[PDB]
Amino acid sequence: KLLRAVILGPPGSGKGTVCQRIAQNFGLQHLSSGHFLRENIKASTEVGEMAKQYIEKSLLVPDHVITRLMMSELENRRGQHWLLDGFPRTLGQAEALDKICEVDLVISLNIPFETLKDRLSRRWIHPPSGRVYNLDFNPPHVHGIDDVTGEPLVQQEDDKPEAVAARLRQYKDVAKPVIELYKSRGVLHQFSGTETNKIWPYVYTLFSNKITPIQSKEAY
Numbered sequence: 001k002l003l004r005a006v007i008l009g010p011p012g013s014g015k016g017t018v019c020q021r022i023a024q025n026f027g028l029q030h031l032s033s034g035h036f037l038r039e040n041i042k043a044s045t046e047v048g049e050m051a052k053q054y055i056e057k058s059l060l061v062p063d064h065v066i067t068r069l070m071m072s073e074l075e076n077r078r079g080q081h082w083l084l085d086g087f088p089r090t091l092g093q094a095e096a097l098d099k100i101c102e103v104d105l106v107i108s109l110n111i112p113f114e115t116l117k118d119r120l121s122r123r124w125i126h127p128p129s130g131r132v133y134n135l136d137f138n139p140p141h142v143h144g145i146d147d148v149t150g151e152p153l154v155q156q157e158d159d160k161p162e163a164v165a166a167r168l169r170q171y172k173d174v175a176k177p178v179i180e181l182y183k184s185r186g187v188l189h190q191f192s193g194t195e196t197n198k199i200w201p202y203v204y205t206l207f208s209n210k211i212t213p214i215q216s217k218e219a220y
Protein backbone atom coordinates (compact mmCIF):
# COMPACT_ATOMS: atom_id res chain seq x y z
CA LYS A 1 0.00 0.00 0.00
CA LEU A 2 2.07 2.92 1.33
CA LEU A 3 5.75 2.74 0.49
CA ARG A 4 8.21 1.65 3.16
CA ALA A 5 11.69 2.31 1.83
CA VAL A 6 15.12 2.60 3.43
CA ILE A 7 18.44 4.10 2.18
CA LEU A 8 21.55 2.75 3.94
CA GLY A 9 25.28 3.48 3.66
CA PRO A 10 28.21 4.90 5.62
CA PRO A 11 28.44 8.61 6.34
CA GLY A 12 29.41 10.46 3.17
CA SER A 13 27.90 7.81 0.89
CA GLY A 14 25.22 10.08 -0.58
CA LYS A 15 22.06 8.97 1.27
CA GLY A 16 20.92 12.58 1.78
CA THR A 17 21.65 13.37 -1.87
CA VAL A 18 19.61 10.40 -3.15
CA CYS A 19 16.74 11.28 -0.79
CA GLN A 20 16.73 14.82 -2.22
CA ARG A 21 16.49 13.49 -5.78
CA ILE A 22 13.67 11.20 -4.63
CA ALA A 23 11.83 14.27 -3.23
CA GLN A 24 12.20 16.15 -6.53
CA ASN A 25 11.03 13.22 -8.68
CA PHE A 26 8.41 11.56 -6.42
CA GLY A 27 7.34 14.18 -3.78
CA LEU A 28 8.46 11.79 -1.06
CA GLN A 29 9.88 13.37 2.14
CA HIS A 30 12.77 11.58 3.87
CA LEU A 31 13.04 10.89 7.59
CA SER A 32 16.36 10.66 9.45
CA SER A 33 17.37 9.97 13.03
CA GLY A 34 19.69 13.01 13.13
CA HIS A 35 16.88 15.28 11.97
CA PHE A 36 14.44 13.90 14.57
CA LEU A 37 17.17 14.13 17.22
CA ARG A 38 17.58 17.87 16.37
CA GLU A 39 13.81 18.40 16.46
CA ASN A 40 13.53 16.79 19.91
CA ILE A 41 16.40 18.85 21.36
CA LYS A 42 14.83 22.08 20.03
CA ALA A 43 11.45 21.13 21.56
CA SER A 44 13.10 20.03 24.85
CA THR A 45 11.09 16.75 24.91
CA GLU A 46 11.76 13.86 27.35
CA VAL A 47 13.83 12.00 24.73
CA GLY A 48 15.53 15.29 23.77
CA GLU A 49 16.52 15.75 27.39
CA MET A 50 17.87 12.17 27.51
CA ALA A 51 19.99 12.78 24.42
CA LYS A 52 21.38 16.05 25.84
CA GLN A 53 22.57 14.23 28.97
CA TYR A 54 24.82 12.11 26.73
CA ILE A 55 25.93 15.02 24.54
CA GLU A 56 26.85 17.18 27.53
CA LYS A 57 29.16 14.34 28.65
CA SER A 58 30.64 14.01 25.13
CA LEU A 59 28.98 10.59 24.87
CA LEU A 60 27.45 8.96 21.83
CA VAL A 61 23.64 9.01 22.16
CA PRO A 62 22.90 5.26 22.39
CA ASP A 63 21.08 3.32 19.67
CA HIS A 64 18.15 2.58 22.03
CA VAL A 65 17.47 6.30 22.57
CA ILE A 66 17.43 6.73 18.77
CA THR A 67 15.14 3.70 18.38
CA ARG A 68 12.79 5.32 20.93
CA LEU A 69 12.53 8.67 19.12
CA MET A 70 12.31 7.04 15.67
CA MET A 71 9.56 4.55 16.48
CA SER A 72 7.59 7.38 18.12
CA GLU A 73 7.82 9.43 14.91
CA LEU A 74 6.94 6.55 12.60
CA GLU A 75 4.03 5.44 14.79
CA ASN A 76 2.60 8.96 14.21
CA ARG A 77 3.08 8.80 10.42
CA ARG A 78 1.24 5.57 9.68
CA GLY A 79 -0.78 7.12 6.81
CA GLN A 80 2.38 8.37 5.07
CA HIS A 81 4.84 6.75 2.64
CA TRP A 82 8.15 6.34 4.51
CA LEU A 83 11.64 6.98 3.12
CA LEU A 84 14.12 6.33 5.94
CA ASP A 85 17.67 7.69 5.58
CA GLY A 86 20.14 5.52 7.55
CA PHE A 87 17.58 3.79 9.79
CA PRO A 88 17.76 0.92 10.80
CA ARG A 89 21.45 1.20 11.86
CA THR A 90 21.39 -2.03 13.90
CA LEU A 91 19.68 -5.45 13.84
CA GLY A 92 17.60 -4.47 16.88
CA GLN A 93 16.30 -1.37 15.09
CA ALA A 94 15.43 -3.49 12.05
CA GLU A 95 13.41 -5.72 14.36
CA ALA A 96 11.75 -2.76 16.08
CA LEU A 97 10.77 -1.59 12.58
CA ASP A 98 9.19 -4.98 11.69
CA LYS A 99 6.49 -4.57 14.36
CA ILE A 100 4.84 -1.61 12.62
CA CYS A 101 5.50 -2.10 8.89
CA GLU A 102 6.65 -4.35 6.08
CA VAL A 103 9.79 -2.91 4.50
CA ASP A 104 9.32 -2.96 0.68
CA LEU A 105 12.64 -1.62 -0.59
CA VAL A 106 16.16 -1.30 0.83
CA ILE A 107 18.87 0.58 -1.01
CA SER A 108 22.46 0.08 0.08
CA LEU A 109 25.28 2.42 -1.00
CA ASN A 110 28.82 1.02 -1.11
CA ILE A 111 31.25 3.87 -1.72
CA PRO A 112 35.08 3.57 -1.32
CA PHE A 113 36.81 5.36 1.61
CA GLU A 114 38.76 7.73 -0.64
CA THR A 115 35.55 9.10 -2.14
CA LEU A 116 33.88 9.41 1.28
CA LYS A 117 36.92 11.35 2.57
CA ASP A 118 37.03 13.60 -0.52
CA ARG A 119 33.28 14.30 -0.50
CA LEU A 120 33.22 15.30 3.17
CA SER A 121 36.38 17.39 2.99
CA ARG A 122 34.41 19.59 0.58
CA ARG A 123 31.51 20.23 2.98
CA TRP A 124 31.24 23.37 5.12
CA ILE A 125 28.42 24.60 7.36
CA HIS A 126 27.09 27.72 9.03
CA PRO A 127 26.49 26.12 12.48
CA PRO A 128 23.70 28.40 13.83
CA SER A 129 21.54 28.24 10.67
CA GLY A 130 22.60 24.75 9.62
CA ARG A 131 23.02 26.04 6.06
CA VAL A 132 25.28 23.56 4.24
CA TYR A 133 27.75 24.47 1.49
CA ASN A 134 29.01 21.73 -0.75
CA LEU A 135 31.99 23.42 -2.43
CA ASP A 136 31.67 21.43 -5.69
CA PHE A 137 27.97 22.31 -6.13
CA ASN A 138 26.88 25.28 -4.00
CA PRO A 139 29.90 27.18 -2.65
CA PRO A 140 29.30 30.41 -0.64
CA HIS A 141 29.05 33.65 -2.66
CA VAL A 142 32.06 34.87 -0.66
CA HIS A 143 34.79 32.35 0.33
CA GLY A 144 34.75 31.09 3.93
CA ILE A 145 31.56 32.88 5.00
CA ASP A 146 27.78 32.33 5.18
CA ASP A 147 25.68 33.93 2.40
CA VAL A 148 23.32 35.82 4.77
CA THR A 149 25.36 36.65 7.89
CA GLY A 150 28.92 36.61 6.56
CA GLU A 151 29.86 34.61 9.66
CA PRO A 152 32.74 32.08 9.14
CA LEU A 153 31.95 28.60 7.83
CA VAL A 154 32.94 25.53 9.79
CA GLN A 155 33.86 21.95 8.93
CA GLN A 156 31.82 19.49 11.00
CA GLU A 157 33.93 17.21 13.20
CA ASP A 158 32.61 14.10 11.47
CA ASP A 159 33.65 15.52 8.09
CA LYS A 160 37.39 15.46 8.88
CA PRO A 161 39.52 12.54 7.50
CA GLU A 162 40.28 10.61 10.75
CA ALA A 163 36.61 10.90 11.84
CA VAL A 164 35.52 9.75 8.38
CA ALA A 165 37.71 6.61 8.62
CA ALA A 166 36.52 5.89 12.21
CA ARG A 167 32.86 6.26 11.17
CA LEU A 168 33.32 4.03 8.12
CA ARG A 169 34.74 1.24 10.32
CA GLN A 170 31.95 1.81 12.84
CA TYR A 171 29.47 1.38 9.94
CA LYS A 172 31.15 -1.74 8.50
CA ASP A 173 31.00 -3.53 11.90
CA VAL A 174 27.31 -2.78 12.47
CA ALA A 175 25.96 -2.94 8.89
CA LYS A 176 26.51 -6.65 8.09
CA PRO A 177 23.62 -8.25 10.05
CA VAL A 178 21.20 -5.57 8.71
CA ILE A 179 22.30 -6.14 5.08
CA GLU A 180 22.06 -9.91 5.59
CA LEU A 181 18.54 -9.61 7.07
CA TYR A 182 17.16 -7.64 4.13
CA LYS A 183 19.11 -9.72 1.60
CA SER A 184 17.34 -12.92 2.79
CA ARG A 185 13.95 -11.17 2.39
CA GLY A 186 14.76 -10.26 -1.23
CA VAL A 187 14.25 -6.50 -0.73
CA LEU A 188 17.87 -5.34 -0.81
CA HIS A 189 19.41 -3.57 -3.78
CA GLN A 190 23.12 -2.80 -3.55
CA PHE A 191 24.96 -0.10 -5.46
CA SER A 192 28.67 0.66 -5.61
CA GLY A 193 30.63 3.43 -7.28
CA THR A 194 32.06 6.89 -6.79
CA GLU A 195 29.29 8.96 -8.46
CA THR A 196 25.74 9.48 -7.18
CA ASN A 197 24.83 10.55 -10.77
CA LYS A 198 25.72 7.11 -12.07
CA ILE A 199 23.81 5.27 -9.29
CA TRP A 200 20.69 7.49 -9.53
CA PRO A 201 19.14 5.96 -12.76
CA TYR A 202 18.94 2.51 -11.06
CA VAL A 203 17.43 3.94 -7.90
CA TYR A 204 14.92 5.98 -9.96
CA THR A 205 13.71 2.81 -11.69
CA LEU A 206 13.19 1.01 -8.35
CA PHE A 207 11.06 3.83 -6.95
CA SER A 208 8.98 4.26 -10.15
CA ASN A 209 7.94 0.60 -9.81
CA LYS A 210 6.38 1.47 -6.45
CA ILE A 211 5.18 5.07 -6.77
CA THR A 212 4.29 7.43 -9.60
CA PRO A 213 6.94 9.88 -10.83
CA ILE A 214 5.81 13.48 -10.89
CA GLN A 215 5.32 15.12 -14.29
CA SER A 216 4.37 18.72 -15.02
CA LYS A 217 0.90 20.03 -15.88
CA GLU A 218 1.81 20.83 -19.52
CA ALA A 219 3.66 17.55 -20.04
CA TYR A 220 0.01 16.35 -20.22
Ligand SMILES: Nc1nc2c(ncn2[C@@H]2O[C@H](COP(=O)(O)OP(=O)(O)OP(=O)(O)OP(=O)(O)OP(=O)(O)OC[C@@H]3O[C@H](n4cnc5c(=O)[nH]c(N)nc54)[C@@H](O)[C@H]3O)[C@@H](O)[C@H]2O)c(=O)[nH]1
Pocket: 009, 010, 011, 012, 013, 014, 015, 016, 017, 018, 032, 033, 034, 037, 060, 061, 062, 063, 066, 085, 086, 087, 088, 089, 119, 120, 122, 123, 134, 136, 137, 194, 195, 196, 197
Ligand atom coordinates in the same frame (compact mmCIF):
# COMPACT_ATOMS: atom_id res chain seq x y z
N1 LIG B 1 23.58 5.75 18.11
C1 LIG B 1 23.31 6.87 17.44
N2 LIG B 1 23.03 6.84 16.12
C2 LIG B 1 22.78 8.00 15.46
C3 LIG B 1 22.75 9.23 16.13
N3 LIG B 1 22.45 10.20 15.26
C4 LIG B 1 22.28 9.63 14.08
N4 LIG B 1 22.44 8.31 14.21
C5 LIG B 1 22.41 7.55 13.02
O1 LIG B 1 23.85 7.19 12.85
C6 LIG B 1 23.62 7.22 11.45
C7 LIG B 1 24.79 8.04 10.86
O2 LIG B 1 24.09 9.36 10.87
P1 LIG B 1 24.72 10.84 10.90
O3 LIG B 1 23.45 11.72 11.14
O4 LIG B 1 25.72 10.94 11.99
O5 LIG B 1 25.35 11.08 9.48
P2 LIG B 1 24.73 10.61 8.04
O6 LIG B 1 23.24 10.42 8.00
O7 LIG B 1 25.46 9.25 7.68
O8 LIG B 1 25.08 11.89 7.17
P3 LIG B 1 26.29 12.18 6.15
O9 LIG B 1 25.86 13.65 5.82
O10 LIG B 1 27.63 12.09 6.73
O11 LIG B 1 26.18 11.18 4.93
P4 LIG B 1 25.18 11.11 3.64
O12 LIG B 1 23.75 11.66 3.97
O13 LIG B 1 25.19 9.69 3.20
O14 LIG B 1 25.93 12.00 2.58
P5 LIG B 1 25.40 13.23 1.69
O15 LIG B 1 24.29 12.72 0.70
O16 LIG B 1 24.99 14.41 2.48
O17 LIG B 1 26.75 13.44 0.83
C8 LIG B 1 27.92 13.93 1.50
C9 LIG B 1 28.61 14.98 0.63
O18 LIG B 1 28.92 14.37 -0.61
C10 LIG B 1 28.38 15.16 -1.69
N5 LIG B 1 28.09 14.20 -2.81
C11 LIG B 1 27.13 13.26 -2.91
N6 LIG B 1 27.28 12.63 -4.09
C12 LIG B 1 28.33 13.16 -4.73
C13 LIG B 1 28.98 12.93 -5.95
O19 LIG B 1 28.61 12.07 -6.75
N7 LIG B 1 30.09 13.71 -6.28
C14 LIG B 1 30.54 14.70 -5.41
N8 LIG B 1 31.60 15.46 -5.71
N9 LIG B 1 29.91 14.88 -4.25
C15 LIG B 1 28.84 14.15 -3.90
C16 LIG B 1 27.17 15.86 -1.10
O20 LIG B 1 27.00 17.08 -1.81
C17 LIG B 1 27.61 16.10 0.34
O21 LIG B 1 28.31 17.34 0.51
C18 LIG B 1 22.89 5.87 11.49
O22 LIG B 1 22.44 5.42 10.25
C19 LIG B 1 21.71 6.36 12.40
O23 LIG B 1 20.67 6.96 11.63
C20 LIG B 1 23.03 9.29 17.49
O24 LIG B 1 23.03 10.37 18.09
N10 LIG B 1 23.31 8.09 18.15
